[PDB]
Structure 1
Amino acid sequence: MQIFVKTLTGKTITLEVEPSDTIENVKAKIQDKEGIPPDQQRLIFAGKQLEDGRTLSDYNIQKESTLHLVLRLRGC
């Protein structure tokens, strides 16, 4: 499977992933490509964040689907 990631800068990077890979592996690949550590990355798909413990299959993420990249945040 091939998925796309749009960083904060606006450029789109291409990730070659597996439907059974967790979000942590995707974050590690994003760190390798861009440099943002998995501590800071938040992956937004369909307007909602992606939980680290879950896998890519649990969010119905398929080929050519775009997951947005945002730095970690919390409410005030």
Structure 2
Amino acid sequence: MQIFVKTLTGKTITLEVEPSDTIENVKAKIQDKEGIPPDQQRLIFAGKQLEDGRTLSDYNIQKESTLHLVLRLRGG
């Protein structure tokens, strides 16, 4: 299925995912397409900060859902 990832600059990227994908898997796809490492990515959906180990289905992320990507430097 297809989901969208929107950045704070307005840029929108389309990803192919499945409900069993983890949030880390989604970050890995963003790394594939954009070169940004998962540990610099914060993903947000439904007003929740998405946890790397949980799945898209855990967050009720569906076809054509839009996630928000916020870049951040790691703690430390």
State the TM-score, normalized to the length of structure 1.
Answer: 0.88
Structure 1 vs Structure 2: percent identity of aligned residues?
99
Deviation at 1:55, TM superposition (A): 0.7
User: Separation in 2 of the partners of 1:51 and 1:10?
Assistant: 23
User: Separation in 2 of the partners of 1:40 and 1:63?
Assistant: 25
State the TM-score, normalized to the length of structure 2.
Answer: 0.88
Q: Is the 8 A contact 2:4 2:66 kept in 1?
A: yes
Which deviates more, 4-13 or 53-62? Answer: 4-13
Deviation at 1:11, TM superposition (A): 1.2
How many residues are treated as equivalent by the alignment?
76
User: Separation in 2 of the partners of 1:47 and 1:73?
Assistant: 21
**1:75 and 1:27, CA in 2 relative to 1: closer, same or farther beyond 3 A?**
closer
**Residues 25-48 of structure 1: per-residue CA shift (max 9 Å, x gap):** 100001111221101100011222
Unaligned runs of 5+ in 1: none
Q: Is the 8 A contact 2:5 2:14 kept in 1?
A: yes
Which deviates more, 32-41 or 53-62? Answer: 32-41
Q: Is the 8 A contact 2:6 2:69 kept in 1?
A: yes
Provide the secondary structure at the position in 2 that maps to 1:39.
helix
